[PDB]
Symmetry: C2
Subunit: 205 residues, 2 copies
């Protein structure tokens, strides 16, 4: 019974480490964070600022793609600073999302909810700390979830706009028409490591 | 001269097996091509359908990024076929560009050429086999090249549209504002292979 905690503890935090050390991310994202002092305008990587329910955990994840490890910053200067820092030490590339530059606009369409296989707006599966509301409109708000890739293709042809669409199976159709899909073993569920803690944390309660 | 016009044919052949075997691409991209029969609608990966002077070769390379190994197909069905094929054998994910679904629209703006640090339209550095004209507007046409990242940031704030912008140093600002940059063991040239296979030709004649 005590070994039961010895076994919990050794991960309910042995994992907090990989987190507070960004193990899944690129050499580059890492280099940038161990020098986090040089960048006061730095905030955090996307996957640490989004609140999604343990449920559609895997949902959102797909709509994001590698955007999970985009670095959010307060302003463009911090961005320039990082781009310069990396460019010097040839530490690799990264994608920065400056809060004072990204577009957060997004539109709702009437009757969409009454379309074949609809399933709700992506924005409805996430929460943001207000001072990050744009980051929300930028990452979602223009995305929609449907049932099947066929529903997706149909929809994308009818409205033929620039709306992102994710199927329940995990496919994605970019605003311009690119179809991303397929499966693997690594699961690649960006929010996993965190969910494995929304558990391990209160699990050992 | 005999050992030469013979050495050359020899390299010529091993470069080709790398091509048909798609050596270097993603396991997934590979799996899809060794089963290329199942997908008659299949065309080729982006990096094999662009025609570019080798001066600009590297330029266009950083302009694409991961889009280099997006798989171009004739129609949505072929896409669905592939997505299903991959989803079964858990061979990984890929991004498919169906010719009958991607948006190729793009706009020119007046006076842009008279903006600080302008350097020309990205479309002007590539050629496409007409039956692929959309693929062109989809990949470029909405992209512009400038001198420095500052020129880029300024421009992106003035017109505040959804135009892609690449600097001469290699940075990129997505239509919505994301900044990608950094150096990383130079080159990684998407066309180096096609370019040499063409070079070995001129060495024979």
């Amino acid at each position: 019974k005590e070994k039961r905690l010895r076994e919990i503890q050794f991960e309910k935090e042995m994992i907090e480490r990989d987190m507070r050390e960004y193990r899944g991310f690129s050499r580059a994202v890492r280099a940038v964070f161990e020098e986090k002092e040089r960048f006061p305008g730095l905030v955090d990587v996307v996957s640490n600022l989004i609140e999604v329910d343990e449920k559609y955990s895997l949902a959102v994840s797909v709509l994001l793609g590698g955007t999970a490890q985009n670095i959010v910053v307060r302003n463009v200067d911090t961005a320039k600073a990082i781009v310069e820092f990396l460019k010097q030490n040839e530490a690799g590339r990264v994608t920065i999302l400056p809060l004072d530059l990204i577009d957060g606009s997004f539109n709702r369409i009437s009757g969409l909810e009454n379309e074949r296989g609809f399933v709700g707006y992506a924005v409805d599966l996430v929460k943001f700390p207000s001072d990050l509301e744009v980051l929300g409109g930028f990452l979602f708000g223009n995305s929609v979830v449907v049932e099947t890739l066929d529903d997706a293709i149909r929809m994308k042809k009818k409205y033929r706009l620039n709306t992102r669409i994710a199927t329940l199976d995990g496919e994605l159709i970019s605003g311009r028409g690119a179809i991303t899909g397929g499966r693997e073993e690594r699961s690649s569920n960006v929010f996993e490591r965190r969910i494995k803690l929304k558990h391990l944390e209160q699990e050992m309660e």
